[PDB]
A paper describes a structure:
Like typical Hsp70s, [name] consists of an N-terminal nucleotide binding domain (NBD) and C-terminal substrate binding domain (SBD) connected by a hydrophobic linker peptide. In the ATP-bound state, the NBD and SBD are docked against each other and the SBD adopts an open conformation, allowing fast exchange of substrates. ATP hydrolysis to ADP causes domain undocking and closure of the SBD, leading to tight substrate binding. Nucleotide exchange resets the cycle and triggers substrate release.
To establish if the selective effect of Ca2+ on ADP binding to [name] is reflected in the structure of the complex, we purified the NBDs of mammalian [name], Hsp70, and [name] and co-crystallised them with Ca2+ and ADP. In each case, additional density in the nucleotide-binding cleft indicated occupancy by ADP and the overall conformations of the three NBDs were very similar. Overlay of the [name](NBD) structure with the Hsp70(NBD) and [name](NBD) structures revealed root-mean-squared deviations (RMSD) of 0.769 Å and 0.734 Å over the Cα alignment, respectively. Moreover, in each structure, Ca2+ was identified in the nucleotide- binding cleft, where it formed contacts to both phosphate groups (α and β) of the nucleotide as well as indirect contacts to protein residues via several water molecules (inset). In contrast, the Mg2+ ion in an earlier [name](NBD)•Mg2+•ADP structure coordinates only the β-phosphate of ADP directly, which may contribute to the lower affinity of MgADP compared to CaADP for NBD binding. The NBD structures also revealed a second, surface-exposed Ca2+ ion that is coordinated by the carboxyl group of D257 and backbone carbonyl of H252 in [name] and homologous residues in the cytosolic Hsp70s. Ca2+ binding to this second site is likely an experimental artefact favoured by the high [Ca2+] in the crystallisation solution and crystal packing. The highly similar CaADP binding mode does not explain the stronger effect of Ca2+ on [name] function compared to the other Hsp70s. However, the IC50 values for Ca2+-dependent inhibition of MABA-ADP release from the NBDs of Hsp70 (444.7 ± 80.5 µM) and [name] (345.5 ± 71.1 µM) were much higher than from the NBD of [name] (57.1 ± 7.4 µM). Given that concentrations of Ca2+ in the cytoplasm are in the nanomolar range, these results imply that the effect of Ca2+ on ADP binding to cytoplasmic Hsp70s has limited physiological relevance.
Residue numbers in the entry: 5 to 384
Write the structure that this text describes.
Amino acid sequence: PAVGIDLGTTYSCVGVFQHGKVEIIANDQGNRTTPSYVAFTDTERLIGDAAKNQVAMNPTNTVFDAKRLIGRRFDDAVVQSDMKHWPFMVVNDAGRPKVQVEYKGETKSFYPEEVSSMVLTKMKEIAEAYLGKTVTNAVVTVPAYFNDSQRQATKDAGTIAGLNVLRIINEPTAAAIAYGLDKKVGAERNVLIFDLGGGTFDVSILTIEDGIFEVKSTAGDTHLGGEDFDNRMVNHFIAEFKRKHKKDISENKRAVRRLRTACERAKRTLSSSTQASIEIDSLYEGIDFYTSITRARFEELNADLFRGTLDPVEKALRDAKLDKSQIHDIVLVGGSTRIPKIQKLLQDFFNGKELNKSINPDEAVAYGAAVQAAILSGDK
Ligand SMILES: Nc1ncnc2c1ncn2[C@@H]1O[C@H](COP(=O)(O)OP(=O)(O)O)[C@@H](O)[C@H]1O
Ligand SMILES: [Ca+2]
Ligand SMILES: [Ca+2]
């Protein structure tokens, strides 16, 4: 049994094509996505939810955003810029970046592909827990703009995890494969992939013909994601708590974290409901924080970030030399594309054109990866 693994910036997802359909596999916590987090404590190494859940208690030894480091050199401008936003240490080992942590009392360093191997190990175990069988063969996805060094380092992460990586394929290709846009009766198809995750915004235009997924353009923002929408909600409620209780909770890591968690949950709920409850017992000094937020307020807090996602779409179209009327298919992927206002903005931008969004947007890449894995293994 060959699996498809979406190794995302903030979440990872594993699917298997069996008996004519994709099954996206829930972890032992019942979650169909797993945080791309690894934590190092005085006793153990944690991966996924367990790692993310203890981040506020152990910030310096909790590693994330390994995908931003993978296949890069220490001196790279992107690495030096990104280090300013991480509580964990990034050190230079002979021109290569390593994350340095405390683990079982000792100072330890790990290459990005070692951190990612631990996430892939977790995704491997999630598939094996469900299938009741050893999982070796996998297709793993990377962004279209990833170079050979980034692709090789991602593949090596799989190998370190004991996975046989059949192929590294582009995330926008996986999304297009999921919706079967390569198997439509016709000539070429122009496809725009609108991919908004937790940390990154990726716009891709492919022209698909004779099984060739030609990248015509890429655009977006490597630092725009769902976490920015969460940030706007947290600042909103910190100001609110300040007004009501004359308490600034900003420098209480635990308090801010629990507010952030509640804010992300509320955001997810606002994609299906016009209102959401914030319910935190003893947020700060035993003071309960029970309030609500309307969809309207959430949209208002994030108005500039939401409509700003259309500028990269325009750029991608210009660089691809296509009018919006020449796009055959629009594909929503990444967890953030569930936000109704984002969906409305993109559909309005494409003058009413229906969006491909029937596949759970945060599962579509793993879905495509799993289809490709079955094809390569000869089980489809
Ligand atoms: N129903 C939802 N409504 C709004 N945002 C959501 C929803 N489900 C997930 N998200 C957001 O999607 C982001 C994760 O996107 P995903 O593609 O799964 O991860 P990655 O960041 O690794 O690409 C998070 O910010 C999460 O809060
Ligand atoms: Ca950001
Ligand atoms: Ca994603």
